[PDB]
Amino acid sequence: ASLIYRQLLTNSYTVDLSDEIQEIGSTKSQNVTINPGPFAQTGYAPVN
């Protein structure tokens, strides 16, 4: 009856195939890099 544990561990490479099957159906999206930092304070010029 331990064969169940042994085989569950052995035949685990198919988990990757299942993951690929899920991934292909997953909706994909991309993110762009965020401009970081203490942005310089620039204000209006002196006008009249």
Partner 1 sequence: QNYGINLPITGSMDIAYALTSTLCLYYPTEAATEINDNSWKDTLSQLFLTKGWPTGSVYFKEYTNIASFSVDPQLYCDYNVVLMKYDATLQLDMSELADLILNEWLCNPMDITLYYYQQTDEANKWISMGSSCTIKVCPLNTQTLGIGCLTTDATTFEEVATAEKLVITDVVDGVNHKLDVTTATCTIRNCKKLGPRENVAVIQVGGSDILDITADPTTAPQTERMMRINWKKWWQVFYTVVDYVDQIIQVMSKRSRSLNSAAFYYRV
Q: What is the helix (H) or strand (E) element at residue 18, kind and residue range?
A: helix 14-25
Q: Check residue 43 for interaction with partner 1 (CB under 8 A).
A: no
Stretch that binds partner 1, among 6-14, 17-25, 30-38 (CB under 8 A): 30-38
Stretch that binds partner 1, among 4-12, 14-22, 29-37 (CB under 8 A): 29-37
In whole angstroms, the minimum distance from the beta carbon of 30 to partner 1 comes to 14
- For residue 28 the two structure tokens come to 């994909």
Give the whole-angstrom CA distance, residue 3 versus residue 10.
10
Return all residues near 41 (Cβ < 8 A) that are at least 6 apart.
none
What is the binding site for partner 1 (CB under 8 A)? 33, 36-38
